[PDB]
Amino acid sequence: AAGTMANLDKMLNTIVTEVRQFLQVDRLCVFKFEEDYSGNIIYEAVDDGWLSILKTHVRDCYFMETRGEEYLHGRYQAIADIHQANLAESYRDFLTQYQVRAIVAVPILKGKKLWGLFSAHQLAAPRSWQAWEIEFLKQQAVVMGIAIQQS
Amino acid sequence: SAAGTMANLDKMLNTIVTEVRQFLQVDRLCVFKFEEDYSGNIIYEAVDDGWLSILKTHVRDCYFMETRGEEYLHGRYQAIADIHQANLAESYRDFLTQYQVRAIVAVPILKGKKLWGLFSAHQLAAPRSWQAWEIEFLKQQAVVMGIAIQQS
Ligand SMILES: */C=C\C1=C(C)C(=O)N/C1=C\C1=NC(=C\c2[nH]c(/C=C3\NC(=O)C(C=C)=C3C)c(C)c2CCC(=O)O)/C(CCC(=O)O)=C1C
Ligand SMILES: */C=C\C1=C(C)C(=O)N/C1=C\C1=NC(=C\c2[nH]c(/C=C3\NC(=O)C(C=C)=C3C)c(C)c2CCC(=O)O)/C(CCC(=O)O)=C1C
Numbered sequence: 001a002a003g004t005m006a007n008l009d010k011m012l013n014t015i016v017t018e019v020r021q022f023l024q025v026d027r028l029c030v031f032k033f034e035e036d037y038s039g040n041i042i043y044e045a046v047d048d049g050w051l052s053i054l055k056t057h058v059r060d061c062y063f064m065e066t067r068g069e070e071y072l073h074g075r076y077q078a079i080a081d082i083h084q085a086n087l088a089e090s091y092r093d094f095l096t097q098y099q100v101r102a103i104v105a106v107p108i109l110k111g112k113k114l115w116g117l118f119s120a121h122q123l124a125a126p127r128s129w130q131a132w133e134i135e136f137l138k139q140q141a142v143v144m145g146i147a148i149q150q151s
Numbered sequence: 152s153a154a155g156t157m158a159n160l161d162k163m164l165n166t167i168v169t170e171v172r173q174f175l176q177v178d179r180l181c182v183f184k185f186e187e188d189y190s191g192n193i194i195y196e197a198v199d200d201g202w203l204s205i206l207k208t209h210v211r212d213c214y215f216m217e218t219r220g221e222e223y224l225h226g227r228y229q230a231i232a233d234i235h236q237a238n239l240a241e242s243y244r245d246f247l248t249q250y251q252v253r254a255i256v257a258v259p260i261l262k263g264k265k266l267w268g269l270f271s272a273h274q275l276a277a278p279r280s281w282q283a284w285e286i287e288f289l290k291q292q293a294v295v296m297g298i299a300i301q302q303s
Contacts, residue, residue, distance in 0.1 A: 007174060014170035022163040022299060136298045143295055146288045147174065 004151050011147050013043050019140050020045035023120060023133060029053065030108070030144070031117040037063045039116065050123055051099045062091065068114030071107040078104045078134055081126035102127035106137045109145045118144065156303045163299050164195050171292055172197035172272075175285060179250075179273040181205065182296070185266060189215045194268075202275045205250055214243065220266035223259040230256045230286050233278035254279035258290045261297045270296065 012030060020028035027050065030043040037060075044054040079085045080102055082095050095103065102122035108115045118141045120133075164182060172180040179202055182195040189212075196206040215223075231237045232254055234247055247255065254274035260267045270293045 011170060011174040014166060018163055018166045018170075022159055024159075132298060132302060136295065139291070139295050139298060143288070143291050146284055146291055150284060 008147055008151055012144055015140055015144060016043045016045045019137070020047065020120075023136070025120040025127075026050055026123045027053070027121040029119055029121075031058070031119060033063065033068065033114060033116055037067050037114075039063070042116075053098050056098070058094070060091075060094070062088075068107065071114050071117075072109070072112070074138070076104070076106045076134065076138065078129045080128050084126075099123045101125060102129070104129050104134060104137055106134070106141045108141045108148070110148045115145065115148055160299055160303055164296060167292055167296060168195045168197045171289075172199065175272065175288070177272040178202050178275040179205070181269075181271045181273070182260070183210070183269040183271060185215065185220065185268055189219050189266075191215070191268065200276070203251060210246070212243075212246070214240075220259070223266050223269075224261070224264070228256070228258045228286070228290070230281050232280045235278070251275040253277060254281070256281055256286055256289055258286075258293045260293045260300065262300045267297065267300055 016028050016030060019025075026048075027044065027046040029041045029045075031039050032042045033039040039058055039060070041053050041056045041058075044052060046052050046054075079087075082092060082100060082103065085092075087095070098121070100121045101124055103119060105117045105119040108118055118137055120137060168180050168182060171177075177197075178200060179196065179198040181193050183191045184194045185191045191210055191212070193205050193208045193210075196204060198204050198206075234244065234252060234255065239247070250273070252273045252275065254277070255271065257269045257271040260270055270289055272289060
């Protein structure tokens, strides 16, 4: 009931806190999709008094049009410097509004469905993400997806 | 920093053990780290409800010392709902009984191709019918621990 949900919430939030300190990333969050693939930042660990985006609602028109279909088979984003990247203007603008300079975003699956994104943000300088860090983030997303599949 | 790399790995493994024990409602959750001779020590533990702690216990398990955990590198793991119903060596049954174990899951932690340790869940109050997703959850947490351990 509400007990199940409190238990999942605490586990997922602990993973976010865990991974943010271990990876030493400025901000780590979990973005959960609504039915229409709008979504909300529902867990967040941000260091040192920096910009919190917890409970921000986002209508990302890439996810809302694709329903995340491209994110179902190990696909992901890892950008060392969003200034350099050949990003869509509208996506660059979203990232800029939330102070992102470097990002890794991996999908969270509930069964065969895209449930959310697990996203690491640097807020000031570029970051050359390592293969192991991307694998760590993906494998923590698997952990989360198994726990989420129980409610 | 050799001091801070070890400290950050310690904080991460201790956080996983503490919160996974509460999430699965396990009586005792352990990380057993192997020495070069495949003796080992319990180096992280979350225990609740006034159950005996085995943190820092040294174990010379003669199965792991004789096999060097090779079977645990080729898909062996242990998931027993009630050790009273299982076929065990009396030596291994004595180990579990000493520490009040009634139900157990034990999965490998790898560092590259080497068996680094075991992630073990003990039920002490009662037998427990482990669900497929709980065994998968423990295996996948052991994967995440392995990736972190591989960095130092
Ligand atoms: C309709 C314009 C528009 C608004 C408004 C908006 O919020 N986004 C947006 C357009 C595009 N988004 C594109 C890609 C994209 N969005 C995300 C979303 C997030 N990353 C996070 O960390 C996070 C949180 C936390 C969110 C909500 C991600 C990960 C991507 C990259 C998708 C891949 O390209 O992999 C995008 C470009 C689409 C493309 O390149 O094909 C546009 C136009
Ligand atoms: C040399 C006699 C002897 C001593 C002493 C001892 O500690 N064990 C032991 C004999 C055997 N152990 C056997 C299998 C086995 N050991 C472990 C070890 C642990 N489980 C934990 O939870 C934990 C901590 C915490 C430790 C150190 C495990 C997981 C196994 C099972 C191996 C599988 O079957 O998968 C064993 C084999 C016979 C049997 O399994 O009963 C003997 C003889």
